[PDB]
Amino acid sequence: KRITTPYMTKYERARVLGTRALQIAMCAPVMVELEGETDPLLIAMKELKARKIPIIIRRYLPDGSYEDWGVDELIITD
């Protein structure tokens, strides 16, 4: 059974927002509706608050094992 913390760390927030912003900048599918938005990163933060992002982080332990957690499934906070 998963052992790592159930919260998302600063670094995970940063990288997931970054990569989803890169994706959204291109024509990748989008799920949250947008109020005239124009910047990728704002779309990214909107979705993250909506927990709509299609990503799974695969945390690595030092010995090669790993866990997976759903971004929609971690504990999130401002």
């Binding site: 600063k10 927030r13 940063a14 990288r15 927002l17 970054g18 990569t19 912003a21 890169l22 900048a25 291109m26 024509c27 989008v30 947008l34 938005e37 124009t38 910047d39 990728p40 990163l41 779309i43 990214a44």
Partner: protein, 199 residues
Amino acid sequence: QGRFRGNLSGKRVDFSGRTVISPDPNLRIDEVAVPVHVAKILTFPEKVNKANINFLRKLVQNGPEVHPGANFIQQRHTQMKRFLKYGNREKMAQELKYGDIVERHLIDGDVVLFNRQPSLHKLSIMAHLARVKPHRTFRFNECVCTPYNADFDGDEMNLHLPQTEEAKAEALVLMGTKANLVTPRNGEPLIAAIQDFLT
């Protein structure tokens, strides 16, 4: 000056500037106001897509003269770098395809770093939110002055502007002023009120 300590760890950089600083209390504690004559020079290589298309048409109509304007275009279907001094620009607003590149100026609300030279500790470099104003010197709120230890005696400040989304995001989330109020040494708070507020 040798190889390593020269151009391996000390590599120089472009998309940057330098200028004098002066106070401006009437802004928030998370914005730095760049001068207009610098916002025409640092440019962001945006990528046009379904959502943002029409805005960038508005920019490309302008040319390099009006502040919100652009300087170069690069195209998906051919990777040439047209220069907006030339040509009937409005047509090139129509010719855009998703995946093309347009190099826009700085626009109000763009993540931009900021720095003071004699780095001593983590906080000597931060990530503000940009704004444009007609004078010729970097202006920001004075509460942030203790971290930098800057004093408006005639100092110089550098400035950078990243070029890839993931880098932009890391600059905002980690290096934002609002996430770095306490110093990481002992938990003391540094960003606070100053002379003439304390009175």
